[PDB]
Structure 1
Amino acid sequence: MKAIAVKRGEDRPVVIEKPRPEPESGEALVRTLRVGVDGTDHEVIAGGHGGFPEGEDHLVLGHEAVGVVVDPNDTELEEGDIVVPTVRRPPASGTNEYFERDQPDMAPDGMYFERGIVGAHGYMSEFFTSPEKYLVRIPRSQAELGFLIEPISITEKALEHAYASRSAFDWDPSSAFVLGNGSLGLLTLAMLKVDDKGYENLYCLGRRDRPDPTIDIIEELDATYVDSRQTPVEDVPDVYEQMDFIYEATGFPKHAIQSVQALAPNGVGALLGVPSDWAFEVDAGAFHREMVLHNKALVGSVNSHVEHFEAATVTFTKLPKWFLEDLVTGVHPLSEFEAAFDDDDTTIKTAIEFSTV
């Protein structure tokens, strides 16, 4: 079968040929339909974040997949089920408490693999296998955009933990601010629009000049676009308002610290970005004091698990159809796969189509 991989010490993604996998007991064989590309694939291509599987000359890319079950083997899935795989798998050494208690999304560094990211091959191949417990059935009509279920689930987890931090009191937020206008930030902005907490005012931070299709999406969602070149995060409360909820999806360390100054009293910031080490001068006193005197919280979140994937299928149904059309800027057949990795300002979310139906 054909797969898209990065080979050791090489620049670009290439097609390689590999044997079709055979499922072991408890695994289904899945025929890949579409696989999404995000920053991590780019990040993994260049070098930073992730790592190749031991003893292998390459890494099959892709962690956002949808496929059709072609051989259910000895599992309780049915031939033709549309499934989305979770990303985390047990490490080489074997199972651990995080997997045994069904919360692999909470496993620390070195106690998990992430398919297509660290230690294990991804899903950009014509077929793959997985244990039934890590394959989530989704409605058949979500198959075409099913690679979006994984990123939606990332936000479903982050919101769950962020909201739990505010559960000891009566919190009624009215404003939310998403930092970043990438595919995660934009998806999140749309989710916040339909969130049960009933946000009235939405804001999204970016740094683009008009005309720009990400600005258009933000404003078409009835949110306010904030240019960070004109209004840094710290200054937002003066120009606009204090924000009850902040969701950080920029990967810019200054935002993690500065968001505390933009939070309303009793607010919470969710941090999703993954930056490199970067040292600079901060007023730690102001950070510390705001957190305490105004009962604020910061919560970090990574990955997601089955329950968040399931929740994502419901959220998906609530998202406007125009939004999904504008977010996915290209789906490319395997024959033209290189186009899926071209990044420019007009490219938002791409995917590669391996097969149909």
Structure 2
Amino acid sequence: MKAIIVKPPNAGVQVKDVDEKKLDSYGKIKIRTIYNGICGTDREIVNGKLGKDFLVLGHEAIGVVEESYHGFSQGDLVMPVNRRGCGICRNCLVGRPDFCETGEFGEAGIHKMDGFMREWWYDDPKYLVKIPKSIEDIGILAQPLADIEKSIEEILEVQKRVPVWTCDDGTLNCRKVLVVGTGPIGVLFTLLFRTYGLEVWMANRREPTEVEQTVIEETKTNYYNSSNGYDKLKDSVGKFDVIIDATGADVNILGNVIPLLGRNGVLGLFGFSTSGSVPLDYKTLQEIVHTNKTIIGLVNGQKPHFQQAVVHLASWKTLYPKAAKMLITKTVSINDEKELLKVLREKEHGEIKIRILWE
């Protein structure tokens, strides 16, 4: 069987025929892969930056069901939930390894579990999300979107501690969000916050790309060029109710944006920072205390969030047709090894989502 394989914690990837008999199987439903998606976590594994001799790569997949089994029909498109329970703690037991208390959960194509960049795989109905044909084109995005659905869901649940966090009209329309970092995570955060009616500011250290500009216009989102800092934003707009870190960046970005957090506000840590150290002085922290501010680490969506992601992706073909068309950067054939290896090892400038097609 053709698979895309890695041999961790060593760097490198191959695109090759492997023994289907040594690959991990997860239940009785056979699924023939049609698309994979590639993200930074995939790049990391390829560049060694993170029984079996190899691991199958990939945690973003849509496949087709080959024969009807119980809930699922032949020809149904499905997406597997990539994070799976440790089998021990109460969070995993209730289907919620995003809150696993042992850290011993499985991750498809990362840890303890062959991924899904392979011709086909066997999975269990309980881990499969139905992907309506009507969103087949952008449906691969339900996986990453799922983390963000979980994040926004959580940030809203936490904000229930504030007696009234709604506006005069009963909505969250008057709440402002600063999303730092564009890239597929910042873009998805923006789209989903806009869907919920909040006002959003996107910030990058540069002017917008064409995708971002289309996002601005179509969703009525604001953009702030943050190359010389945040002072002008705070002077022009004042403070934000929610701030999302969506950069894989130097934690010092947190020093820059923390002073833009408003009363009762939330700083959502979602990006996985790779460099730096950020000083917090006593005046900063005492202010956090005085104004009921919260900082929260945001991670991993589970099945309910994949299903939310599907409904939202569906709404975005209606509401935001032009942005939705720009979500998929390009599709690369599983058969074009040179171009595949290239996209696998490296992100192109301003990439949203690279897709793998198995044909």
Higher mean C-alpha deviation, range 114-123 or range 11-20? 11-20
CA distance in 1, matches of 2:304, 2:350: 33
CA distance in 1, matches of 2:133, 2:18: 29
Post-superposition CA distance 1:99-157 (Å, at most 9, x none): 22211111146311110122322111110122211111121222232210011111110
CA distance in 1, matches of 2:284, 2:62: 42
The amino acid that maps onto 1:301 is L
Q: What are the ranges of 5 or more consecutive residues in structure 1 without an aligned counterpart? A: 50-54
The match for 2:314 is 317
The match for 2:206 is 208
1:62 alignment partner, SS class: coil
Higher mean C-alpha deviation, range 306-315 or range 21-30? 21-30
Instruction: Tell me if structure 2 keeps the 8 A contact 1:333–1:354.
Output: yes
Post-superposition CA distance 1:236-279 (Å, at most 9, x none): 32243211111221133223454432112111122111124633
Higher mean C-alpha deviation, range 220-229 or range 58-67? 220-229
The match for 1:81 is 76
Tell me, yes or no, if structure 1 residue 354 matches structure 2 residue 358: yes
CA distance in 1, matches of 2:294, 2:94: 27
1:268 alignment partner, SS class: strand
CA distance in 2, matches of 1:208, 1:343: 18
CA distance in 1, matches of 2:54, 2:240: 44
Percent of pairs identical after alignment? 28
CA distance in 2, matches of 1:274, 1:346: 18
Tell me, yes or no, if structure 1 residue 230 matches structure 2 residue 234: no
Post-superposition CA distance 1:133-185 (Å, at most 9, x none): 11111212222322100111111100111111111321134211111111111
Q: Closer, same or farther in 2 for the Cα pair 1:266/1:317, shift >3 Å?
A: same
Instruction: Tell me if structure 1 keeps the 8 A contact 2:26–2:123.
Output: no
Q: Closer, same or farther in 2 for the Cα pair 1:96/1:293, shift >3 Å?
A: closer
Instruction: Please list, as runs of the form range in 1=range in 2, the aligned pairs for 1:189-268 lying within 5 A after superposition.
Output: 189-195=190-196, 198-199=197-198, 201-208=199-206, 212-220=209-217, 221-232=219-230, 236-252=233-249, 253-268=251-266
The match for 2:300 is 303
What RMSD, in angstroms, separates the aligned Cα atoms of the two structures? Answer: 2.5
Instruction: Please list, as runs of the form range in 1=range in 2, the aligned pairs for 1:43-192 lying within 5 A after superposition.
Output: 43-49=44-50, 55-72=51-68, 75-91=70-86, 95-108=88-101, 110-168=103-161, 169-172=163-166, 173=172, 174=174, 175-192=176-193
Q: Closer, same or farther in 2 for the Cα pair 1:151/1:97, shift >3 Å?
A: same
1:36 alignment partner, SS class: strand
Post-superposition CA distance 1:196-243 (Å, at most 9, x none): xx22x3211112356x335424433332222232224x7632243211
Instruction: Tell me if structure 2 keeps the 8 A contact 1:261–1:290.
Output: no
The match for 2:169 is none
Instruction: Tell me if structure 2 keeps the 8 A contact 1:37–1:349.
Output: yes
Tell me, yes or no, if structure 1 residue 340 matches structure 2 residue 343: yes
Higher mean C-alpha deviation, range 241-250 or range 268-277? 268-277
2:326 alignment partner, SS class: helix
Post-superposition CA distance 1:311-343 (Å, at most 9, x none): 111111222121121221101111222353342
* Structure 1 residue 10: Cα displacement: 5.7
CA distance in 2, matches of 1:217, 1:231: 24
CA distance in 2, matches of 1:108, 1:257: 30
Post-superposition CA distance 1:12-69 (Å, at most 9, x none): 43212124469978431111110111111111211223xxxxx433222211111111
TM-score for both structures, normalised by structure 1: 0.87
Tell me, yes or no, if structure 1 residue 2 matches structure 2 residue 6: no
CA distance in 2, matches of 1:348, 1:305: 22
Instruction: Tell me if structure 2 keeps the 8 A contact 1:69–1:78.
Output: yes
* Structure 1 residue 284: Cα displacement: 2.9
CA distance in 2, matches of 1:25, 1:256: 40
The match for 1:18 is 18
The match for 1:27 is 28
Instruction: Tell me if structure 1 keeps the 8 A contact 2:55–2:114.
Output: yes
Q: What are the ranges of 5 or more consecutive residues in structure 2 without an aligned counterpart? A: 167-171
* Structure 1 residue 300: Cα displacement: 1.4
* Structure 1 residue 9: Cα displacement: 6.7
1:119 alignment partner, SS class: coil
Tell me, yes or no, if structure 1 residue 283 matches structure 2 residue 266: no
Q: Closer, same or farther in 2 for the Cα pair 1:27/1:215, shift >3 Å?
A: same
TM-score for both structures, normalised by structure 2: 0.86
CA distance in 1, matches of 2:324, 2:94: 35
